[PDB]
Design a protein around this ligand. Sequence first.
Ligand SMILES: Nc1nc2c(ncn2[C@@H]2O[C@H](COP(=O)(O)OP(=O)(O)O)[C@@H](O)[C@H]2O)c(=O)[nH]1
Ligand SMILES: [Mg+2]
Lengths: 159, 318, 80, 39
Amino acid sequence: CKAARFDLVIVETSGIGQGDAAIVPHVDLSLYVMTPEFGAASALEKIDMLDFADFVAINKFDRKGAQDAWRDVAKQVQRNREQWHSRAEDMPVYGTQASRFNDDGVTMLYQGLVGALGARGMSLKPGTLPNLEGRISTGQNVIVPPARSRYLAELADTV
Amino acid sequence: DGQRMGLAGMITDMAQRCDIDLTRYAPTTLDTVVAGDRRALAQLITALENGKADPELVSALHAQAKAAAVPVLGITGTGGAGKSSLTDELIRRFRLDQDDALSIAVISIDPSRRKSGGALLGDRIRMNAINHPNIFMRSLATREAGSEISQALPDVIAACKAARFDLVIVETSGIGQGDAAIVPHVDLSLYVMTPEFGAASALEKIDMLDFADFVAINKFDRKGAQDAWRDVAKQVQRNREQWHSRAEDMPVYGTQASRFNDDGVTMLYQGLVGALGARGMSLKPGTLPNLEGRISTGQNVIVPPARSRYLAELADTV
Amino acid sequence: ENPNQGSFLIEELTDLVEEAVLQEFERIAERGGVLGAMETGYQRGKIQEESLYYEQLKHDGTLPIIGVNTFRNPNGDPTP
Amino acid sequence: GPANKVRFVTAASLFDGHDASINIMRRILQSQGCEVIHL
Ligand SMILES: Nc1nc2c(ncn2[C@@H]2O[C@H](COP(=O)(O)OP(=O)(O)O)[C@@H](O)[C@H]2O)c(=O)[nH]1
Ligand SMILES: [Mg+2]
């Protein structure tokens, strides 16, 4: 594939376990996805993939604990990184939402990946999208504020 | 002094000072082992782990294991599923029902750190009900680059079996999707799952379900509990190709480990008792309320989720 | 425009249907919103199951539907 | 290094609600590439 003189190569592996990090030496850049439901905070400190992932993304704030997972994951990434003298909110971990179109976190991740590719020296044109800032999307353009998920219960109680 | 010389340097000196192996201290026979010692038992376990024993010893171990005729039950699943808690609950139910008249052995396997070289064998912490001479537990690490089982796991399994115990439970590390390292070596298979596992179609490519004997879903608190159970049961039926049955009767039941005295836990214990009886191991007649059912009704739950977000209502009132 | 004069049955059916509908509403809410229902295909599968049950019963014939399960006139079924 | 691995166990004495010291000890020990069962 590389010999095809293409701009970019992207490879997705199979669903991984815990002790599996075979992709480390065969590629250049490492993106690892994660879910808010992953287990206890003390548990996560045994996920070996965090030892090499250049970026880690928790996707979709479907369930709860999204912010909790974000804080814990960022803190553990710092812990494994040995970059003690830096605060967590700047770490290269971003949480997004796949199903929702035009997600803010997706844009943030794209801007970061553009920066990373520029670091490796990849020829390309200057940026065009509004270079927004942030670390977690606010869930904009959502149909319903989660505050009223169970309105039917309110209607039943009303009746 | 810890601030002066530094905790890092103190730990380095501690690590380097304790550096010596105890390989020469292993025994050379199994007589005292079958006698019932524990320290020599751990000695044999360690010697097998490092492979410092004669092949004659291992051959004798296998010979005795061929006469062991004992239950070997493995429990595995995704990482962070919570299998350890389920194991603890099962052990507790065993003790409660059988009046501590059994000889329980437990083996856990945890991943190693492929970079640093160390590991964090953090599973004994969750379990709490092993405060007894008649139930023994042991943990082992990965230590190998690729697999999720020991380079001598069958050897230690045979050694543990030779100790004339009642039943051996074994758990590996959190598995991926293409792994079946627990299938051929053990006798019975328990697989844990979570409601947040992806699309319904995704359920059709979890290879572990192919050899699974019994599948349980944990932490029913979250959404989709009933829907996830439905899809799991339907997929299990499809993979079994036993079209002659209706869906609800398939041998798949899911429980909520954390909350005390879960009904589904008792149901699963009843099923596993039936399974062992079908394979024929000596045990006393049942004594607990042996209910029927398929999914726990959330008994004794503190708050019916129908009133989960009351605080928002109070704020709106104000 | 009000045939309820003399009717216990209309009121009984009304209240029972209302209770059933509200119970289904509570179940839907416990399913976590209509959007979540759409994502998980809850109601789609439910309708699938109920349609299968209805068709199975219709093919069984234990439900009286006039002119399909009986009254098969000996003239055959040409149906131009 | 030596084929043997360092196995440790860490815990707190009865009735001391603080725990962070255990964590600080154990994470450093882990950094030193030693297997420890923290109970
Ligand atoms: N909601 C819920 N959480 C649970 C339940 N059982 C265990 N957990 C969570 O799982 C954690 C323990 O996971 P653990 O067994 O140590 O991870 P494992 O050893 O890799 O399987 C606990 O901290 C609990 O928060 C349950 O029944 N319901
Ligand atoms: Mg574990």
